[PDB]
Design a protein around this ligand. Structure first.
Ligand SMILES: O=C(O)/C=C/c1ccc(O)cc1
Ligand SMILES: O=C(O)/C=C/c1ccc(O)cc1
Ligand SMILES: O=C(O)/C=C/c1ccc(O)cc1
Ligand SMILES: O=C(O)/C=C/c1ccc(O)cc1
Lengths: 299, 303
């Protein structure tokens, strides 16, 4: 068996309401090595499933400074809680409302199931552009993951903001993510063509594309490139990976989704027009964050 | 160039699109019915845009009004509480876990490993022990809430042990008038290596003592700087620079979950006497043999 060693019934241990010795097993050398191996930190007690770190993220003081410098009515920034101890510093994303656009999208789907009014779709479009302009022209940073999930709304669209701003996609002088160890990822359904090319060139327009698909969501209340494999005329009121078109999905990844003009009307004119040019197959053909702003400002 | 055939339409050149630096026309495909159903299917919300990977929702969590009341009311020196950002009344409020320092006890038990490798001084372990006990006592007595999963990574340290708080407190494991989690919904999950017998058993009963067990295991972590029941079958090739899944005795693991791990007696000394006693009683197979948080606070504030 394993070497045991009795621990005599002490007075202190009695204070714990347990008066008796306790036998315990022995261990020569603590398997520290295995417990701290990469396998362990990865499989046992995953840091991805850890709450505190998810909120208070350890950041390299240089990035931390950049992330704390984000200051714009349409961007959600970060805040620290101490002066950079030597090396890193914890940062927490600040608050920008109780709901995310995504939350409102599905909130609606379960009620009216009616597209967002054109007036509100444009408003969001304005503020999001405003915020992208700031990120692109001011901070020289590409968001890289635009979508309804990363747009938080305050009340009845009192304020529209963009969150989860990174520091890993620095925009070169030619407004192009030239940095060597910099990879665009975003969220599959929202990826631009150049993010799928496996070799394409990531420009600032990568965001404009995603910005377009986000306006699309407010029109269709749906996810880009997710269509029922076999319609059946929207028959059964239940869906799963069986009636999902694996086919069309990986096919359209990076292309402009089909517009539901049938459900919309005439007021959604500008919305559709803006959506179209932002999803244009070619990067150069897509407006700059800035262009979209003034082109929408008083015009 | 593969594409497909399907209804399309032409958006005439307009002043607007021109103003967007285009001044041309665009041809767009067409859709009659929006896949709104499939998109919000329980399947879609689970595999596409996984909220478990959403940053904003990770910090600002939506809680039911009654749960937020409880969470907002957490107020103890050794408990990391929550903060709201808008006046509630509605049937749902967002709360963010508060700040309690830069490092977790797990971070420390590991900076410690990357150097000294010498088990935290006995005195510090007792300090950590008393503070955790006070916080756990607050949860059990004052709020009637079992923590759920005590472990080093859920203990945050401020500066040089200037502050020690338990975090990630939830409300789904409410305690009985009998100190047992009987709510039909409740379900002890914890973290495998730290699970007590009761939580490993097929349908054991969970009491405030389940926390005492994992609490004990956390003190063990401070002496061994290891994860409970993670041992290599190879005492032989042990000390080999790197370690892999192929050194981990998969059986001994699942066989020891819930049992008191072995104590590295030869690495400690006689100042680790109280620490070793506390560790032992807190890890008895029988919950009734483990002291309550209250009894631990008293025994440590000794005299
Ligand atoms: O709960 C955890 O964090 C870890 C679970 C786990 C389960 C089986 C393993 O072999 C390792 C980790
Ligand atoms: O955005 C704010 O006003 C405050 C945010 C915040 C986030 C985490 C905290 O621990 C405290 C404040
Ligand atoms: O990145 C995501 O959020 C989603 C990824 C994903 C990958 C394969 C699928 O079939 C669906 C979603
Ligand atoms: O409990 C909290 O931490 C926050 C309370 C709160 C109350 C009213 C506000 O307008 C914002 C926060």
């Amino acid at each position: 068996s394993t070497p045991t060693i009795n621990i005599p019934a002490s007075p202190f241990m009695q204070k714990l309401g347990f008066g008796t010795g306790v036998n315990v097993y022995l261990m020569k050398r603590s398997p520290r090595g295995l417990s701290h191996s990469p396998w362990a930190v990865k499989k046992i007690n995953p840091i991805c499933n850890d709450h505190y770190r998810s909120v208070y993220q350890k950041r390299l003081m240089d990035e931390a400074k950049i992330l704390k410098s984000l200051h714009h009515p349409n961007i959600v920034g970060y805040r620290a809680f101490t002066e950079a101890n030597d090396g890193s510093l914890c940062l927490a994303m600040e608050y920008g409302g109780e709901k995310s656009l995504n939350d409102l999208i599905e909130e609606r789907y379960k009620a009216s199931q009616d597209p967002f009014p054109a007036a509100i779709i444009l408003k969001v479009a304005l503020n999001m552009a405003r915020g992208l302009k700031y990120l692109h022209q001011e901070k020289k940073l590409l968001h890289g993951d635009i979508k309804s999930s990363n747009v938080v709304i305050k009340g009845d669209f009192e304020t529209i903001k963009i969150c989860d701003v990174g520091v890993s996609l620095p925009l070169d002088e030619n407004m192009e993510v030239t940095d060597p160890e910099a990879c665009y990822i975003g969220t599959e359904p929202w990826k631009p063509k150049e993010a799928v090319e496996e070799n394409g060139v990531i420009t600032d327009k990568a965001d404009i594309f995603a910005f377009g698909l986000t306006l699309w969501e407010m029109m269709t209340l749906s996810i880009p490139h997710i269509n029922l494999s076999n319609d059946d005329d929207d028959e059964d009121k239940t869906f799963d990976e069986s009636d999902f078109d694996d086919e069309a999905y990986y096919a359209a990844l990076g292309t402009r989704p089909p517009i539901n003009m049938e459900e919309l009307d005439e007021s959604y004119q500008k919305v559709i027009e803006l959506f179209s040019v932002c999803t244009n197959e070619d990067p150069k053909d897509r407006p700059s964050a800035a262009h979209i702003v003034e082109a929408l400002e008083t015009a």
